[PDB]
Write a protein that binds this ligand. Structure first.
Ligand SMILES: CC(=O)O[C@H]1C(=O)[C@@]2(C)[C@H]([C@H](OC(=O)c3ccccc3)[C@]3(O)C[C@H](OC(=O)[C@H](O)[C@@H](NC(=O)c4ccccc4)c4ccccc4)C(C)=C1C3(C)C)[C@]1(OC(C)=O)CO[C@@H]1C[C@@H]2O
Ligand SMILES: CC(=O)O[C@H]1C(=O)[C@@]2(C)[C@H]([C@H](OC(=O)c3ccccc3)[C@]3(O)C[C@H](OC(=O)[C@H](O)[C@@H](NC(=O)c4ccccc4)c4ccccc4)C(C)=C1C3(C)C)[C@]1(OC(C)=O)CO[C@@H]1C[C@@H]2O
Ligand SMILES: Nc1nc2c(ncn2[C@@H]2O[C@H](COP(=O)(O)CP(=O)(O)OP(=O)(O)O)[C@@H](O)[C@H]2O)c(=O)[nH]1
Ligand SMILES: Nc1nc2c(ncn2[C@@H]2O[C@H](COP(=O)(O)CP(=O)(O)OP(=O)(O)O)[C@@H](O)[C@H]2O)c(=O)[nH]1
Ligand SMILES: [Mg+2]
Ligand SMILES: [Mg+2]
Lengths: 88, 57, 426, 71, 427
C-alpha cells in the first residue's frame, strides 16, 4: 500500500484524510523514521528533511507566489510578449 | 481570476498554499476532497510499474 | 514589606539554598553569627524581605529546609553559614524515599507535609505583606520531585492570591545518574504547570557547558554549578530590595512574560561571566553584556533558541548605566535577529534597572527568556518515558506504593498537550 | 563574474565591438542595479532576472533592425 | 574610525604578523603589557584603527591568529609582544594539515572556519566604521593556502563591500622546501583573483637578495625577512593613522592602482635601506629615496620589471618634504625610463605624503607597483605544475580528500587566463 505522510498537512489534513480513505491508502499522522512514498506538507518544502519519495511542495514556491516576484516575471514576459500577456 | 463583463479574465493573486480546509461546508468538501483525490490518483507510485508490466505482458 | 518565604527540598535544593543564603547574606552584609557588619545605609532598608529581626540585632532567614533523609540537615547545619538558620525550621524524615516519587508524594511525604505547613504558616503570619514563596528542588528524585509537588499543591490552595516561583532542575539526557528519573519528571511537569506562577528550567548540562567553555574551569564541582543558580536568584529579586530607575517586582515580571496562563517556563542567564585571565582583555559596557546575554552559549538550559522563537524577554540590569544605551541596545537585537522573535508581540523585551551592583562587579544583567524551543526539553523526556512504559519497567515500585496505571498515562497526556500548545505559537 | 566571462568565451559573443572591459562593465552595472533593487542590499552575485536583462541587452546588440521576438 | 581586522594563518603568516604587531606597537607607543608610554599625542588619536580599548587604558590588538597545529600558537604566545593578544582570539586545531591543500580547504580545516568566522563577526561589530580586512599567509602550505582561501571566500560572502588586501608569500624557483608546493600554489591563485582587492606578492628569494646585497648581512634568518614585510605593511596604511598633505587610504590606492578588475597583483618595496657601515657616506634625500625604490634589485618580488611595462605605481612618502621635489623627481622618473610604462594611461604615478616619519628615521617611502612582469611569477609555477600532472604524482594525497581531477585543470586554466590577461595589455 502507498504510504502518505500527513504530519504537516495543516489545513489540508481532513480533506486529504478522506481522500486517503477513498484510495485505501494507509497513513502516517505522526510520521516515521523510514522513507515514505508521499510527503504532504502545508506551507514550506523545507518542513521535513526528505531524501526520497514524493513531496507536495516544490522548493521555494512561497517566494515565487509573492506579489513582487510574480509581477517581475509578468513584466518580463510582457516585454517578451505584450499582446499575449495582457491579462495582467 | 476576476471575470470581466466582456468575458476577459484578469489574474489577481496566486497562492502557493491555498486554504484546503473543508470546514462542514458541502461545496468546499465536494471541491477540495475531489481535488486531492485526483491529485493522489495521478501520482500513485505503482501506476508506472503497473503500466510497464502491462506493456511487457 | 513585600517579603518572600524560602523553601528548600531535597539534597539538590538544600545545597542550592545554602549557597544562595551565603550569597544573599554577603550581599546584605550579614555575619555568619547573624549580626550586621556592613558599610551602607541601603543594605538594611528592605532587609525585611528575607530576614526576621530577632533579639539584639540578630537576623534570621525564612529558610524552611525539608528532606526525607536526615543527612542533608546535618550537612547544612555543620557547614559555612549553617547556624544562621532557625533551629526548628529543620523538618526531616527517617528515610530518603528511595528514588521513588510515589513514596514522597503519597506515603512518606504525607507524614511530613503537615509538619512543614505548620512552620510555613507560622512564618508567613509573621509577615507584613507576603509577596510570595519560592522553592528550589530537582525534578529527578523522590523527595525533591514529590515533596515539591505535594507542598506546592497544598500551598497554592491556602494562598491562591500570592506568588509562587520554582528554580527546578530539569533532568538531562546525557548527564544521567538515575535510572527511574524520567518517570519522576513525567509525573511532576503536570503539577508544575497549574500550581506555580513561574518556573525556571535549570539544566545541569548547560551549567557544565558554561563552566567548561565560558569560565575555562578544568574541574568544576557542585558549588560552582550552584553559584550560577544563586546569581540568577539574586538578580531576579534585586528590584524588591534596592532602589532603581525602573523597578520591576516579581508580579511586574510575571505580567509581561506569560502571554497565556500555562506558558511560564523560562531560560535564565547571567551577563558578565568571563574567566579569570580574560577579564583584563574586556570592557564592561552595556552592548557587550547584551551580547553575552542573548547567545545560545550563556543560557542555563539545554535547548537551542535558534530552533524556536522568543515570545518575550526580560533583562533586569544592575548597575549605574544610562537608559538611552539600554533602549538602543534592545532595539538593535530585535532589529538584527528579526526571525528569532514572534511577529505578533511588538517590542518583546521588558527592561528594568537597579543602581546597586553585585559586590565587586560594576554592572550585570539577568536574562529571563520565554522561548518555544523550551518544548524540546519536554519532547526529549517523553520519548524516554515512552521507551520505559510500553514495556512496563521499574513500575512495580510505583504500583505497589499506592499509584495506579492511569496516572502515568494522564501525566504523559498533560505533557504532550503542553508541548503541542507551546509549538502552536511558534 | 567568472561564469559570465566563461559564457561569453563559450558562445563567442565577444568581438572587436564588444571587448572584455565592456562585458565586465555591463556585469558590474547590472549586478549593482539588481542588488540595490532588492530589499536586502547584499545580493552577492547575479540572480536569474539580471541574467534575463543581460541576455536582452546582448540580443539587442546583435541582429539589428529586427523584431524583439526574432531577437 | 576606519578600523582594519587582521588575520594570520599558517606558520609564515603567524611569524610575519608577530613581527608586524611588534613594529606597529613600537610606533604607537604600546608596551608589551598593553599600556601606553609615548611622547607624541598623535600616536593615540587613531589607535582605534588597529587596537580596541579595554579597561585600565590597556589596548588590545584587533588580530585573529589561526592555525591547525597548536605548537606554533605557543610560539606566538611565549615571545616578545606576545601577552597582548586576546586569549580567545587564538583559534587552533590538532594536526597541521601537512602540505595538503585539500585537507585545509575541505576536510579538517572546514570544522574550524566556523569558529574563525564567529571571532571575525565578534571583532567586526565592535568597530565604528570598518574599512577592510588584511591577511598574512603563505601560499604553498596546507593550512595557509587552504584555510586562507576558505576564510577569504566566506568573508566576501558576508561583507561584499570592504577592502581585502592580502600579503602573501609565493613559491620561489631557487629556494624550495616542499615537493608538492606548486600544487597548492596553483590551487590558490584562482581563489585570490575573484575574492581580494589588493594582493601583495612576496618571495623569499627576493628578500634574501635584499639582505645579501643592499644590507650586506652575514646570516639572514627569517627575522630580517619578516622585518622587511612588516615595514612595507606598516607603510601602506599610514595615511589612516597619522596626518599629512596628500593623504591616500586603501580605497584611493585601489582606485588609482587597478585599471581592470583582475589586475590587482602588485609588487612591494621600501626605499630607505642601507648597511650599517654606509649610513654616513650617503645623504638621505628625496632623490636618493626615489632612486632606490625604483631600483630593480630593491624589489621584494622575483620578477624583473625590465621585462615588462609598469601599468601603474603608487608611492607613499613619510616625513617632512616639499611637494615640488616629489612631483619633479617622480615626473623625471617617467621621462627617462619612458619605455617601461604603458602609453594608453598617462601619468602612471600616484603620490601620497604623510607628515610623521618612522621612528629613528627622517624620510621613508613605501612603493607599490602593478607591472606586467608579475606574469613570470605565475608562469614558472604553471610549468612546474605541468611537470607534475602528465605523470600524475602525489595526486592521491589530494584525491583522497574529495578533490576531483577536474578542479586541477580548472585552476590551471584560470592561471593561464590571468597570465594571458596580463600579457595582452603589454603589447
Ligand atoms: C579575578 C576577579 O576579578 O575575580 C572576580 C570576578 O570578577 C570573576 C572571575 C567572577 C568569579 O566567579 C567565579 O569564579 C565563578 C565560578 C564558577 C561559577 C560562577 C562564577 C568570582 O568568584 C565572583 C566574584 O563576584 C562577586 O563577588 C559577586 O558579587 C558575586 N558574589 C558571589 O557570588 C559570592 C557570594 C558569597 C560569597 C562569595 C562570593 C555575586 C554575583 C551575583 C549576585 C550576588 C553576588 C568576583 C568579583 C570574582 C571571583 C571571586 C573570582 C565571576 O562571577 C560572577 C558570577 O559574576 C565569574 O565570571 C564573573 C566575573 C569574573 O570573571
Ligand atoms: C644605527 C642605525 O642607524 O640603525 C638604524 C638604521 O637606520 C638602519 C640600519 C635600519 C635598521 O634595519 C636593519 O638593519 C634591518 C635589517 C634587516 C631587516 C630589517 C631591518 C634598524 O634595524 C631599523 C631601525 O628603523 C626603525 O626604527 C624604523 O622605524 C623601522 N623599524 C621599527 O620601527 C622597528 C621597531 C621595533 C623593532 C624593530 C624595528 C620601521 C620603518 C618603517 C615602518 C615601520 C618600521 C633603525 C632606525 C635602525 C636599526 C635598529 C638598526 C634600516 O631600517 C629600515 C628597515 O628602514 C635598514 O636600512 C634602514 C636604515 C639604516 O640602515
Ligand atoms: N546542581 C546540583 N545537582 C545535584 C545535586 N545533588 C544532586 N544533583 C542532581 O540531581 C539529581 C539527584 O538529585 P538529589 O539527589 O538532590 C534528589 P532527592 O535527594 O531530592 O531525591 P531522593 O533520592 O528521593 O532523596 C541528579 O541528577 C544529580 O546529579 C547538587 O547538590 N547540585
Ligand atoms: N619569509 C618567511 N617565510 C617563512 C616563514 N616561515 C615559513 N616560511 C616559508 O613559508 C613557506 C610555507 O611554510 P609554512 O610551514 O609557513 C606554510 P603552512 O603553515 O601553510 O603549512 P602547514 O603548517 O604545514 O600546514 C615555506 O617556504 C617556508 O620556508 C617566515 O617566518 N618568513
Ligand atoms: Mg535524597
Ligand atoms: Mg606547519
Amino acid at each position: 500500500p502507498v504510504t502518505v505522510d500527513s504530519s504537516k498537512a495543516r489545513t489540508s489534513l481532513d480533506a486529504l484524510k478522506i481522500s486517503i480513505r477513498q484510495l485505501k491508502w494507509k497513513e502516517f499522522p505522526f510520521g516515521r523514521r523510514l522513507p515514505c512514498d508521499i510527503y504532504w506538507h502545508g506551507v514550506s518544502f523545507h518542513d521535513n528533511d526528505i531524501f526520497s519519495g514524493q513531496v507536495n511542495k516544490f522548493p521555494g514556491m512561497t517566494e515565487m507566489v509573492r506579489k513582487i516576484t510574480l509581477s517581475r516575471a509578468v513584466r518580463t514576459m510582457q516585454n517578451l510578449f505584450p499582446e499575449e500577456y495582457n491579462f495582467y | 481570476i476576476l471575470l470581466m463583463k466582456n468575458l476577459k479574465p484578469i489574474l489577481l493573486g496566486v497562492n502557493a498554499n491555498p486554504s484546503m480546509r473543508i470546514e462542514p461546508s458541502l461545496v468546499d468538501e465536494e471541491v477540495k476532497v475531489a481535488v486531492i483525490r485526483d491529485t493522489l490518483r495521478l501520482m500513485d507510485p505503482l501506476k508506472k510499474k503497473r503500466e510497464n508490466q502491462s506493456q511487457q505482458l | 514589606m513585600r517579603e518572600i518565604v524560602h523553601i528548600q527540598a531535597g539534597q539538590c535544593g538544600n545545597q542550592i539554598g545554602a549557597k544562595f543564603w551565603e550569597v544573599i547574606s554577603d550581599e546584605h552584609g550579614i555575619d555568619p553569627t547573624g549580626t550586621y557588619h556592613g558599610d551602607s545605609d541601603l543594605q538594611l532598608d528592605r532587609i525585611s524581605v528575607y530576614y526576621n529581626e530577632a533579639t539584639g540585632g540578630k537576623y534570621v532567614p525564612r529558610a524552611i529546609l525539608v528532606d526525607l533523609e536526615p543527612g542533608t540537615m546535618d550537612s547544612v547545619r555543620s557547614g559555612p553559614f549553617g547556624q544562621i538558620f532557625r533551629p526548628d525550621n529543620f523538618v526531616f524524615g527517617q528515610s530518603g524515599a528511595g528514588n521513588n516519587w510515589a513514596k514522597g508524594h503519597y506515603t512518606e511525604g504525607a507524614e511530613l507535609v503537615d509538619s512543614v505547613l505548620d512552620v510555613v504558616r507560622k512564618e508567613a503570619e509573621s509577615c507584613d505583606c507576603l509577596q510570595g514563596f519560592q522553592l528550589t528542588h530537582s525534578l529527578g528524585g523522590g523527595t525533591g520531585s514529590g515533596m515539591g509537588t505535594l507542598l506546592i499543591s497544598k500551598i497554592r490552595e491556602e494562598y491562591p492570591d500570592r506568588i509562587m516561583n520554582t528554580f527546578s532542575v530539569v533532568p538531562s539526557p546525557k548527564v544521567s545518574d538515575t535510572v527511574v528519573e524520567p518517570y519522576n519528571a513525567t509525573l511532576s511537569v503536570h503539577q508544575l504547570v497549574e500550581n506555580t506562577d513561574e518556573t525556571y528550567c535549570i539544566d545541569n548540562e548547560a551549567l557544565y557547558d558554561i563552566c567548561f567553555r565560558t569560565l575555562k574551569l578544568t574541574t568544576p564541582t557542585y558549588g560552582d554549578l550552584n553559584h550560577l543558580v544563586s546569581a540568577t536568584m539574586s538578580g531576579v529579586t534585586t528590584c524588591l530590595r534596592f532602589p532603581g530607575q525602573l523597578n520591576a517586582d516579581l508580579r511586574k515580571l510575571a505580567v509581561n512574560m506569560v502571554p497565556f496562563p500555562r506558558l511560564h517556563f523560562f531560560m535564565p542567564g547571567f551577563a558578565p561571566l568571563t574567566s579569570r585571565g580574560s577579564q583584563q582583555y574586556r570592557a564592561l559596557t552595556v552592548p557587550e553584556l547584551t551580547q553575552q546575554v542573548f547567545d545560545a552559549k550563556n543560557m542555563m538550559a539545554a535547548c537551542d533558541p535558534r530552533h524556536g522563537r522568543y515570545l518575550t524577554v526580560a533583562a533586569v540590569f544592575r548597575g549605574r548605566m544610562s537608559m538611552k544605551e539600554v533602549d538602543e541596545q534592545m532595539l538593535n537585537v530585535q532589529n538584527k535577529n528579526s526571525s528569532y522573535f514572534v511577529e505578533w508581540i511588538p517590542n518583546n523585551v521588558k527592561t528594568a534597572v537597579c543602581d546597586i551592583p553585585p559586590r565587586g562587579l560594576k554592572m550585570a544583567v539577568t536574562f529571563i527568556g520565554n522561548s518555544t524551543a523550551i518544548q524540546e526539553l519536554f519532547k526529549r523526556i517523553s520519548e524516554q518515558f515512552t521507551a520505559m512504559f510500553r514495556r512496563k519497567a521499574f513500575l512495580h515500585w510505583y504500583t505497589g506504593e499506592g499509584m495506579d496505571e492511569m496516572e502515568f498515562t494522564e501525566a504523559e497526556s498533560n505533557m504532550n498537550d503542553l508541548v503541542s500548545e507551546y509549538q502552536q505559537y511558534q | 563574474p567568472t561564469g559570465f566571462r566563461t559564457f561569453i568565451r563559450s558562445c563567442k559573443l565577444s568581438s572587436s565591438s564588444l571587448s572584455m572591459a565592456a562585458v565586465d562593465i555591463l556585469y558590474i552595472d547590472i549586478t549593482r542595479r539588481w542588488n540595490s533593487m532588492t530589499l536586502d542590499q547584499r545580493d552577492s552575485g547575479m540572480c536569474l532576472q539580471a541574467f534575463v536583462e543581460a541576455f536582452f541587452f546582448l540580443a539587442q546588440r546583435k541582429f539589428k533592425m529586427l523584431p524583439l521576438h526574432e531577437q
